[PDB]
């Protein structure tokens, strides 16, 4: 909301004459009490010959691209200057604003007698933008006839010593979107008497002598007040005086005709939007009713709106007059020949206007004030103020007829309920001991009726303050007017906390551990790539395709939430590779979204109580499963190239090692088992188990998936479900025997298909407690042992707890281990050795 | 009431003076302020803290409740500690 300081100063000055403050101080005071000041614009300065001119002659220059005009301009004292201008929104006889040779326009432009388009141009005719007077639009500024004589000083006529304040009013302060409301706020801040510009001393009521039009109101539309008054026989050719067109321009409104201009002016002045109907274009009774399915209205701008059965209209016998609270319609629109005007002063339902305007994308000046509740007490006063002013400008009478529907039964008293609040409650909440009588003085300034009953005030807020409705609301009024800067900084004592949880501590350890091992964390996106599961070649019934779906995504082809973190990880990989960073390991710890049934929403639960355990359980059950995952991808070189050697490309074993890093970080033991599971390679994919619970997969990606996806050849990947990895808090007590160890190496021949870990387990199982360590050295194949067999060489370290192991005692333990491998995996001993 | 404060217990009235009597001290009352003269075999009893321990141990320490104190906003670990 833009408005100019002069107008705001004028309204404040009625009850505190002589009031005046710098823009700086005004900006600061506005911020301190709660109003965001987006910009402070003083009206761009001019120097020198910038005066009113009158266009005495126009000559259309032909032969150029656009239409150009050589103009004779009367600039004062019977001097006529020739001026080139490219606009077209002016005729002979029009007052304009000329910047003449020697003048300096805002932006540091000096005007000079140039030659242009074949003629001499002694300056230029100005636009409201070029003078930093108002918004840039097509064409130059034209002053209304009789605003000033040719030769008058531009800066004084235009009022360029004024400053416009651009504010962002918060939706709880609708009353502040007008000179009325902001002026009241300043009188509160500055401790001034305030004369309300909507009151009767300042708007004397016009007569009330019978209805002004037939009106039926379906009251379930939420209309709270609906008033009409007519002004007849107005000059359709009159224009608004300069002072009024100016104030509208500084407020962001382009003036058009007195019928419209006067309703925009009173809207800005008092905060009650208004509308002017061409009365002679209404047919019959005015009806306020809901719209029907499929109904249409054409609004002032000539655009057909598709309506909705929750939209409130004004209709007559013939057509639609208004989308009530949002925008008038074409059928009763004031237009060039309109002589008899019916003025609408309505109070619509805030939620109704909100829904309708969002749905139609019509955030009009009217709608935005109704959304935030307009003061119903001032409808007739805004009506009367508006009628007098229209008659005064365009010269008709104000008919003494008046409709004033005020509900059924009529509501005569618009005040909210009273609020009971303890007198020191603002003191407690602020942590300040305010001077005595402070809370009651400040609530008085904002227009509430305050009465004392010991320690308990009763506060009845004014009608323009529907936001003031609990004691909390009243505290904010006291605290903001006293200033928030007076509130001290006092650390609270917080109780002994329990610190971070196991799961939180585990996710940090997983991240530190992966980052040290060379992985770079990304923030994954939860919006899947389009068709990623078709690229992976997933079956139609694969659980990962059952995705939750967003309904208004920022990319229309990426609306599915992720059931897996790999898509986002692979996306960041592709980005790194495409920028020349080809040796990359990335990881993510984030939640997935895995829905169980269909999207089942739970109905609204009353918020005047807490939900019951059953209601919470039902809300939880309605949401998708959202477990925490950890995932990683690797491509390129795992070990970089350097003096040591050429480096080592990523292989599936590096993803297996990433499982082991995560598991070590989680203090749990894993087992890897061969598995087939897209998007992994079928012979290089492992399913990960903690105990007997599957927790995810790891390995190399399927080369077909890599190819269809544009991934680096050989990309590996790992994904684990962190919710499936149980907590462990081990309390180890390692036996550390100091007696000498015995080292023996044993080679076993097994079927190629037997996993190496199976052979190690079998050797450990049979060897017993004497086996301190087992480790795989060699995996050898060759013809002499069998085309489908392989030799595994294990390094065994034996150690006794109480004695030095004899070497025969160790060989007994080996024999037992070899026999166990025979019985379990069919192993055949090939040879043993005393590791030297 | 000094033993009551230190223990965080509201001992029955006349408790501190009865227990100091048992240990052989001469106890005299002057409003809210006792004067306590310990016996010769008790050279350890020589400040008010010393007398508190006598009351508290004879009443039993098990009666003292478990009450977490409010500790103020701490600043956490230092840079050097976090670095190590």
GROMACS .gro file of C-alpha atoms in nm, chain A residues 491 493-494 496, chain B residues 68 70-71 73:
model
    8
  491UNK     CA    1   1.852  -1.628   2.939
  493UNK     CA    2   1.716  -2.165   3.295
  494UNK     CA    3   1.662  -2.482   3.084
  496UNK     CA    4   1.902  -3.092   3.261
  904UNK     CA    5   1.824  -3.177   3.963
  906UNK     CA    6   1.890  -2.577   3.702
  907UNK     CA    7   2.228  -2.517   3.530
  909UNK     CA    8   2.295  -2.185   2.942
   0.00000   0.00000   0.00000
